[PDB]
Design a binder for this molecule. Structure first.
Ligand SMILES: *Cc1c(COP(=O)(O)O)cnc(C)c1O
Ligand SMILES: *Cc1c(COP(=O)(O)O)cnc(C)c1O
Ligand SMILES: *Cc1c(COP(=O)(O)O)cnc(C)c1O
Ligand SMILES: *Cc1c(COP(=O)(O)O)cnc(C)c1O
Ligand SMILES: *Cc1c(COP(=O)(O)O)cnc(C)c1O
Ligand SMILES: *Cc1c(COP(=O)(O)O)cnc(C)c1O
Lengths: 294, 299, 296, 294, 294, 295
């Protein structure tokens, strides 16, 4: 309409009316998980895959609760419909909620359940989408798997907010981080791909397993582009034939420079373009489409 | 009313009316820091040290904002007064707030500022405080300093919520974690102390530098108890003469067992008792006291 | 099969009650020895050659090479089992650096202690837990780095996992898995780990003892056209898996219904777990990889 | 000179008759801890400190058992007398024993308790004591504290047997190992000291806290020699003014070379000699002495 | 007219006269990269692949400069011609050069460009090639990827010179190093292969990606020998059926012993021999050859 | 502009004619160590301490060779005199040299010995020395002690050249690096100090033990400023009361910002200023001075 409409605990409310309690454990302790699915031209894309991953994060965090997957699916679709946006970024969130008493046991909780729908967003302006972004490598490393596993898509992102501040101060568009073995992982919003001698490579470990990343591997196979999940160092990225990131926010995004090394060739390169064009062509098929109308 | 009164962005509102926006970056991204100070019998204890630590976290997270240190002090005192408590647990929080402008630049923001005051809390019931608690060592490690430094007291604690899940499932009262070198660090709420041959030891690195921890070392010196900050492994804890944790939530807390190893001797041990008594004696005094009533200036 | 097990020790067959390890055996004082364990079921030893291969790998890596031939060890394994009158058995064979030889102990110059100990076949859980699944935790203790005491050794140096066992029992779990220092799941003291996700079988790739049961599971998966992958897995992968099971010469495949408070989704045992377990025991009621205690 | 007499589970038996069961968990699983104390000219030295450390390892490994500290002290003295010795190397061992019950629960066990006594031993021959030994640095690292803590003095030493094999193949007297941060730790038998500009230094972490090490720090203080526990790398050792190792087997032992770097100055150096002399002068007294007679 | 002729910044000079400035940043700071290609019987082998790798290292180190790849190729060919060696080891080097102004900015520099041609060299004498060499594992680890990436072939090799000192003092022919996870990486001159149960294995990470290593994998496929890139520990090496290293200096080199463990079976083993013979057969053809033609 | 004069293997030559061979192992393999001492108003400062460290590096790298410590000292002093500078940056270098005999064995070598004298250099311009520099934290870590120990002052610095390119591309004056435990170590040219509540702190491990760093600790004691060597994280630096780096190239250098965190209070802070003032006061005295001219 005017104000965004929020789904929150079963109610649809204008954002200015929707309320998280100041003692919600999602707020005080970061005790929640989330996922983000997108709509393009009236169709939500890979809603089932994103719900699968959401419920994976829920299982690992012991956030299992009574709201069915079907009810979550209905809430996602209906919240999008009520915001009237055909192109949208759709975030769904569950937290451990407000304390039952001062006797807090994370196995005994009433969840906070939210859907927030905003306009579709890219991660760079149109010029940088066409000519490529500049990335740096952060001084901050990714979380080890035995701390807060990167596989979680969760509320605990102060780490990457401070990386963002670092990137902006250094004059870069974004920053990738390494794992503690010095191999390139991902960025806060995106997974990383490189191309070398006609082969597509992407980090294997220490990452959130993006749905866009999954889709790019699927498209590569369909396009007869060989691909490999493997450990990559920054060196691999600097010498690559092509570099791009990918995210639900904008799909594939070409990279023209990493840490002062201009990627050789023209950016975007030919495999980057082929994958990008195939991604957006797939999204006008009925493959993985959930219509907001139908 | 017994409904809590909270400070939020300059207003004092009943908790049920106070609102955090669902798009607050403290909520969506854990982009916020916090601290907790306690009141006992009408005095806040070590308010200045807690404010200094809060503003350290703010500085490191680039959360600098327009509310001064003494405005936070006034908000802390006034929120406590409005809740009618002389014994209290006082949490104060700043977040990067709701996004400002089209493109979110964390250097340009309007903060969310909150004070939440509740009754004073201990980390264990009175029987466990008297006999000592049972701790395990978690399978989850602390954050490396080059990820999310343990020095931040911040909203990003899913890590320790899952550790708590595991501790409860395993039948323990709480869990310590190690750093990635295998040395004991801390727990989510507390720092760790041990005693060996009359000397007090506490981990040196990979921790939140607790104000209770600081106070314990100050008290040890006043009691002529030698102390050392050093790297400790779980082995050191199992074989210690005494073990205790410490937190603003309850002061010192004796530990009778860690990971199936019963700490030898009587629990609480004599140095634990001496430190615990000197702590609460210190707080029946005016030392590091900010009174809830009358003028709050130190003299 | 008596009230007194009979063991092989340095060429002699005698009751365990009488058999003697010296208090100054370096296997005792220093853990300077390696071992392996093979099983017999319904009159057949299973994969004896594979277990002997692994034993002699451990021997080679620890420079425990000695005179007793592989054929001699095979003969002693079979004969010790027969002397105990067992058709179902758990058979442990051990070599140590032995008692000090010479004045200056030099690990290249030694007289080994060679033992075969035979006991009834054992499972790692009782019948109800084999049927419904066990509960595992993740240990606070990590596996050994490859540059300390490589996990590839099957050796006597297991105080590490004895203390893990104490911790698991105190915590109310059936057993504990450990991680490596990168935080990826490795194994347990007795078993390797498998998970199932979306119809694919996964198992840790590094930082483990390469179990013979593990080898067999992968062979059986291929025979059943179940895709499999060796890869790094974190605890997260385990919590979210469709199915989880461990495997060991002690009992074969063992379903897992819960890890660290996360109940594995679906029914335990899951369909791939059941298919592999069934195929394992079917394989062993044949003569595939069988050495008959009979000789026939 | 007849065969050694061993204490085992309350009995004093000739070694040839003393039996560890093939299924003792100390044998099959290395489930046991040990300590070693020495006698010199009729006096056991620092018996109480060694018993304290033994019972520390017992506590950490949950090997608590019924044999009292007094009973262990009595067994240590009596076994030595029973072997007719006035100087001795005395090893005392407790294991988790033979399994008790149907279900192996390490919390419920019957221990194996052993005392093995032999003549006093040094770690190097006369010439090497006089002129110094040659050490290398192993390719094998010490155990991380969260695996099998170095603080345990335990039966699980295949690790250092293989280090010994490598040292002998390489032509060295012994090998030190590093921790995983690359700092020098210890050897299988000894702790490590260096001297630089008149100050004694010794590794602070990742080690067995030797009783000889403790004694060396006490003697340094008596001699007004400043000392520090600190992280040391191999570099620190190569450039040191003096280097020596220490152990109950032989006391201090000078080191003339590490990994091809000859330690500068005369070996043994002046502080090494002062500490060595003060240790043996202490050993000739009754300080920290438990006499074998009276 | 018998001494070596050096290419240096466009001039061909006797080695005696060729000069690196004492303030060249390749000298003072190790600020340079290099590669080495070989000639056999008048053919340079895989010159294009070695140039590809050289320009990879240049790209990663921001050593891009005005000398074209064709110019480098011509300089390599012509320098080899002028030295009159039909069998040769050809080293080509680029450094950041002498500081180019009052502010030293590594982005603005005039390079030092050198080609040095020497006789072809094996890494062991012919008897050791026949019987196999003896390798140890170094106490020194490889560089982490986030320090100085092992993917660089660069001037910064004090690390391996000290490892060589260690190996010689210990009486070994050479030393392998591990990465910080304890898995075998490589040596200063060579990559490492093992054979187990008819399959060829080689480390996957933490290494220079040798061109000889690439060639070995190609030859194995030609010979229908299965191969895998994977993490290997020292244990894997000790128990292997066969072990060999490989390098542009000498091709494949059999290994008969590692760290006191004699590799089982005959050395060289059958797969080692098959690959070695296939390598040298290839070197006697025009495959991948750039002829030296006057 | 007279040409610089270089000491090289016993000869004093104009830089233009001084030659390193393209096959010197210092060039091809980085097989060499070095140190740098400074002269100020005609006095070399702490020459003996720098020679001590140089010969420590030599010992650890087994670069032991025939040129005595006194011959090195005389070469350092004479090379400086011949360049006619009263303020100088003096670098002395030994490498494993050109290969000798028939097979290269690093235990048997003929060294390359060089002294290079240049004008005294600061690490930032006058405005930045006055108001403080801006530092970032590098994505590249320091060398582990069991790879190439940071205690070496050696020729193998491609690592820090690439860190420099990154700092310059990011718009910073320089970059600190951490060790692999995430604690702050040092920069290519300098050690790092912070001040918190009247106490001076500096990293304890994973660093070159600088002579300027040694001097700062000395001066702090002389000024009754407490100090500690300890592990510090980037967090410690952001929240410090004062931050400064130190080097033979320029002494103490104030730091006004690290990685977008402006250091609180006025830069340079009071302890930074007191130490800086005491450093240059010490250097205007006899203390640790070797005069360039005879007496
Ligand atoms: C969500 C996210 C991504 C992108 O995942 P998609 O499923 O493709 O949107 C990448 N990295 C991180 C850290 C993320 O949180
Ligand atoms: C706040 C907290 C403590 C306790 O600190 P105090 O200042 O004594 O209340 C200990 N550890 C962690 C992780 C904490 O967050
Ligand atoms: C022996 C053992 C196993 C199981 O191996 P199997 O050959 O299948 O019996 C697994 N992990 C460890 C650590 C073991 O010692
Ligand atoms: C026992 C031992 C020592 C020496 O300790 P002392 O108490 O002095 O005999 C040193 N290192 C290790 C690994 C040891 O086991
Ligand atoms: C160059 C080199 C090799 C061998 O590579 P080739 O291309 O086969 O000559 C192996 N390891 C290292 C460290 C090297 O520098
Ligand atoms: C030389 C250097 C320093 C400064 O040392 P000074 O002796 O004070 O000049 C600091 N860090 C590194 C890495 C250096 O090489």
């Amino acid at each position: 309409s005017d104000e965004p409409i929020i789904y929150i605990n079963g109610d649809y409310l204008p954002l200015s009316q929707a309320r998280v309690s100041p003692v919600d454990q999602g707020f005080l302790l970061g005790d929640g998980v989330f996922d983000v699915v997108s709509a393009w031209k009236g169709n939500i894309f890979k809603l089932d895959a994103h719900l699968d991953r959401f419920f994976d994060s829920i299982q690992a965090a012991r956030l299992n609760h009574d709201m069915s997957r079907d009810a979550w699916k209905e809430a996602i679709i209906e919240t999008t419909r009520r915001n009237g946006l055909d192109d949208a970024s759709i975030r769904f969130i569950v937290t451990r909620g407000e304390p039952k008493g001062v006797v807090a046991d994370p196995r005994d909780f009433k969840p906070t359940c939210i859907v927030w729908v905003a306009p579709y967003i890219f991660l760079a302006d149109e010029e940088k989408r066409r000519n490529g972004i500049r990335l740096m490598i952060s001084a901050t490393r990714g979380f080890p798997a035995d701390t807060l596993d990167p596989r979680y898509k969760c509320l605990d992102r102060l780490h990457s907010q401070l990386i963002r501040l670092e990137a902006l101060e250094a004059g870069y568009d974004d920053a990738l981080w390494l794992d503690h073995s010095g191999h390139v992982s991902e960025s806060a919003a995106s997974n990383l791909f490189i191309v070398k001698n006609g082969v597509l490579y992407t980090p294997s470990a220490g990452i959130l397993r993006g749905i866009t990343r999954d889709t790019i591997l699927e498209l590569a196979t369909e396009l007869d582009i060989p691909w490999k999940e493997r450990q990559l160092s920054a060196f691999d990225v600097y010498i690559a034939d092509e570099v791009f990131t990918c995210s639900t926010a904008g799909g594939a995004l070409p990279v023209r420079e990493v840490a002062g090394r201009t990627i050789r060739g023209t950016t975007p390169g030919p495999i980057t373009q082929a994958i990008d064009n195939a991604y957006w062509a797939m999204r006008e098929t009925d493959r993985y489409a959930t219509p907001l109308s139908g």
